[PDB]
């Protein structure tokens, strides 16, 4: 009956049935676990159930200068060795049954907002250690192929940033989730924006941007107002370096369009220095706390025009009913003045 | 083109005329920038997709000691450099366009890829060209044999003088100590 035995690899290949015909299309996943254990992990070659000690395998060749003969362990010593090899199995099972935990980004069972680690270094040798990345969107996209039918590709929208004002975003799509993560990490660095941050905590001016179908309204906020933004804009601005900001998104809430519009608006900012250059006038900041003190932030380098700007008695600005309601105190919604967690 | 309006003098019975005042003003900076890159040991590549004078472009580039591309431009040439050219290569530091349009009358691949890879581009742009992406555009004529020969000779001597004066600067550097 010895010729009826096979190799452990062949036994495991049939036991786990990893290449089953029912697991191809997707009929499986009902019992989603496939664990294979190597039986030769802690198996010392010379030891056996009889407890024989062989001079070539178990015990050394020479003792006290003389040759060792074939020995056999005592009944109790063999039982001690047996207890050791048994307790090794409980130790390995204790290591196996425990799950290494993972930080949750936004919820306990979503990929959005989790840390993925620094991206891989480039070919020339540049290493991105200060850069940090966060998963923004994950999606199991399906395609229709003639033979297989449903083709499952994991696609991820992922943004990278270092915290010094340089950040970017890109999409990685692959058959495997780990491959998609790696592709997104390696492709996000190549598309990096620079975000002009006034005093390194907030944007220069309020931005009202209209993307494809996503409206974003972002207002400059004080030092004490830390990132009361959407749950994805907060992550993006945390990667960028913005510590103080308020954002409201209206219309479509698509993640890709939201990120694209956010980056476009953050890149289309106007620095005080460029405003002073284009209008040949001094830019003076009037802090509410500092009273009427004329704080100067940027100077119009070049020709300073002595002709003053036309003072408009009635400004023709593009106002919004949302901010008018906010200013008039008509915002009676219970969802606006709630107490939320910190940054 | 809609973006050639400021670079034109007028229209002579349907045919538009390019004023040469801004042509020379642009060409001074173009030649200065081309010569400085050669002086600072930079890779200069002449991209030109035109099946009439291509031989002249490779001859000019070989005499200059710089590189040329007048054949069909492959897809990932400038972007997928670690695969199309070799394991680790050096990207061209300057791109000279003698014909910004290919045989399809579409904008060239290299003018977009240089902007993608942050590679300076100096280019002779005709009335139907798009100068928005070219770092140093010079409005001129790229279909006249005398015009293209003039441009090729100017860019030949601009590189030759830059390299030679680099050699005498190094010679004086050796005598400095």
């Amino acid at each position: 009956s010895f010729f009826t035995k096979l190799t452990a690899d062949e036994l495991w290949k049939g036991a786990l049935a990893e290449s089953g015909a029912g697991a191809r299309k997707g009929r499986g996943k009902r019992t989603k676990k496939k664990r294979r254990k190597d039986l030769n992990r802690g198996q010392i070659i010379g030891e056996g159930r009889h407890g024989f000690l062989w001079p070539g395998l178990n015990i050394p060749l020479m003792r006290n200068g003389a040759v060792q003969t074939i020995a056999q362990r005592s009944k109790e010593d063999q039982e001690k060795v047996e207890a050791d090899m048994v307790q090794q199995r409980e130790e390995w099972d204790r290591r196996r049954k425990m799950k290494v935990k993972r930080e949750r980004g936004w919820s306990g069972n979503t990929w959005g907002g989790v840390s993925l680690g620094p991206p891989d270094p480039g070919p020339n040798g540049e290493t991105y250690d200060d850069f940090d990345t966060r998963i923004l969107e994950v999606r199991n996209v399906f395609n229709m192929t003639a033979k297989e039918g449903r083709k499952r590709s994991v696609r991820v929208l992922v943004a990278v940033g270092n915290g010094k004002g340089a950040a970017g975003f890109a999409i990685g799509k692959a058959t495997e989730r780990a491959d998609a993560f790696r592709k997104a990490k390696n492709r996000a660095v190549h598309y990096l924006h620079y975000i002009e941050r006034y005093e390194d905590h907030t944007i220069y001016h309020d931005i009202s941007l209209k993307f494809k179908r996503t409206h974003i309204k972002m207002k400059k906020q004080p030092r004490g107002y830390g990132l009361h933004c959407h749950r994805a804009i907060m992550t993006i601005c945390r990667l960028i370096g913005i510590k103080d900001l308020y954002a409201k998104v209206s219309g479509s809430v698509n993640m890709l369009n939201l990120t694209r519009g956010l980056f476009l608006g953050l890149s289309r900012q106007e620095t005080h220095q460029q405003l002073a250059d284009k209008k040949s006038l001094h830019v003076v900041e009037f802090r509410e706390e500092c009273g009427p003190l004329p704080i100067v932030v940027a100077s119009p380098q070049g020709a300073l025009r002595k002709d003053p700007e036309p003072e408009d008695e009635v400004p023709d600005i593009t106002l919004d009913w949302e901010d008018v309601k906010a200013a008039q105190g008509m915002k009676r919604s219970v969802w606006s003045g709630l107490k939320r967690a910190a940054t | 083109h809609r973006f050639m309006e400021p670079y034109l003098f007028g229209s002579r019975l349907g045919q538009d005329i390019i004023d040469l005042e801004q042509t020379a003003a642009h060409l001074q900076l173009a030649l200065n920038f081309t010569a400085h890159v050669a002086y600072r040991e930079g890779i200069i590549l002449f991209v030109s997709r035109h099946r009439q004078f291509a031989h002249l472009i490779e001859t000019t580039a070989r005499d200059c000691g710089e590189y040329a591309h007048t054949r069909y431009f492959k897809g990932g040439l400038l972007t997928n450099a670690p695969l199309l050219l070799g394991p680790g290569v050096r990207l061209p530091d300057l791109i000279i366009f003698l014909h910004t349009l290919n045989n399809v009358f579409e904008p060239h691949v290299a003018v977009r890829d240089a902007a993608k890879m942050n590679i300076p581009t100096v280019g002779i742009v005709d009335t139907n060209c798009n100068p928005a992406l070219i770092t140093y555009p010079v409005p001129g004529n790229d279909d006249s044999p005398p015009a293209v020969r003039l441009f090729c000779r100017l860019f030949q001597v601009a590189i030759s003088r830059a390299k030679e004066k680099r050699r005498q600067v190094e010679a004086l550097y050796r005598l400095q100590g």
Binding site: - | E41, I43, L45, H55, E58, T59, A61, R62, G65, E66, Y67, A68, H69, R71, K74, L77, L84, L85, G86, V89, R90, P92
Partner: protein, 328 residues
């Protein structure tokens, strides 16, 4: 990988010396054919694929052509056409076009001066010259090539060859020329033999459908055929079998002018007749001049018959007749 090949050179050389020591031949006179015989004797691997046999050759013969370093330590590429993808192919094309323009200018000056001293060297039919195939261009230009680019290069070479040629460009084109062997399919004619006071003697061998036939022909005897010790009429009672025998003799008008003995083994009644026909045709070449041998081979007497019985395939009846296939 240049140093690896360099080390393979010295390893191959020391192995060659040791192989010469093993065989006892002079290492100075020890050559590649001797290496092949020595390996075939020491390592007698019986395999149907010759490439799987143990082989010991020069490293530049075993390993493919490796690309040289394309740039220096400063990063600047050596060739000026490096950024075109195929520097060697495009350099070849550039050189060919430069020489075309040089020839055009020189011929224009010669025509202006009214001097026609060139000749037409394009027709090399008696030499059997052909153009390089894509493989022969790929072994020269180490990088990969394309069919359209190869066709463009060939069409440019035709333009170059269609112009009045000088000295250097003809030699430049000549390295892209391959000579073919003589496709002359004339057969070898067996010389007339004289054996034991017998004149006009010859022999022939034929084979058709597992039937081997030897024909011994005397050109000095009367017209008769003796098959396996008996007469041809007795051996071939069928009229068609005797018509096969008359087919070679009647074509050459040698019916009653030759005495022949035929010995045929294997096959059936008609296979033996066909084999004897083929052997007789191959034997009657010596007694006739050359212009009739070609007529005979164009009539089909000097060509063998490869129409053999095909092996029966599993699942079928007669190697073509399949089983009764029921649709439902």
């Amino acid at each position: 990988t240049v140093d690896f090949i360099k080390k393979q050179i010295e390893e191959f050389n020391i192995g060659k010396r040791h192989l010469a020591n093993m065989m006892g031949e002079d290492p100075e006179t020890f050559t590649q054919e001797d290496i092949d015989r020595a390996i075939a004797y020491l390592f007698p691997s019986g395999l149907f694929e010759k490439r799987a046999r143990p082989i010991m050759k020069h490293p530049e013969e075993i390993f493919p052509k490796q690309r040289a370093i394309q740039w220096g330590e400063d990063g600047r590429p050596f060739h000026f056409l490096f950024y075109t993808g195929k520097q060697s192919y495009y350099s070849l094309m550039h050189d060919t076009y430069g020489k075309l323009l040089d020839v055009e200018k020189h011929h224009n000056q010669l025509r202006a001066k009214d001097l026609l001293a060139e000749k037409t060297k394009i027709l090399k039919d008696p030499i059997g010259s052909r153009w390089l195939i894509k493989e022969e261009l790929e072994e020269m230009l180490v990088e990969k090539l394309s069919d359209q680019d190869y066709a463009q290069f060939i069409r440019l070479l035709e333009r170059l060859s269609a112009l009045p040629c000088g000295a250097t460009e003809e030699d430049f084109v000549n390295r892209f020329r391959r000579s073919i062997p003589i496709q002359s399919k004339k057969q070898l004619i067996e010389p007339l033999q004289y054996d034991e006071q017998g004149m006009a003697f010859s022999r022939g061998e034929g084979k058709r459908k597992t039937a081997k036939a030897e024909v011994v022909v005397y050109g000095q005897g009367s017209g008769r055929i003796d098959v396996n010790g008996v007469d041809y009429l007795l051996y071939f009672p069928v009229t068609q079998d005797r018509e096969q025998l008359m087919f070679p003799l009647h074509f050459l008008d040698r019916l009653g002018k030759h005495d022949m003995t035929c010995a045929v083994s294997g096959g059936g009644r008609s296979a033996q007749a066909g084999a004897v026909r083929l052997a007789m045709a191959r034997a009657l070449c010596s007694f006739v001049t050359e212009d009739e041998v070609e007529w005979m081979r164009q009539a089909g007497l000097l060509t063998a018959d490869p129409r053999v019985r095909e092996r029966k395939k599993p699942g079928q009846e007669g190697a073509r007749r399949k089983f009764t296939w029921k649709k439902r």
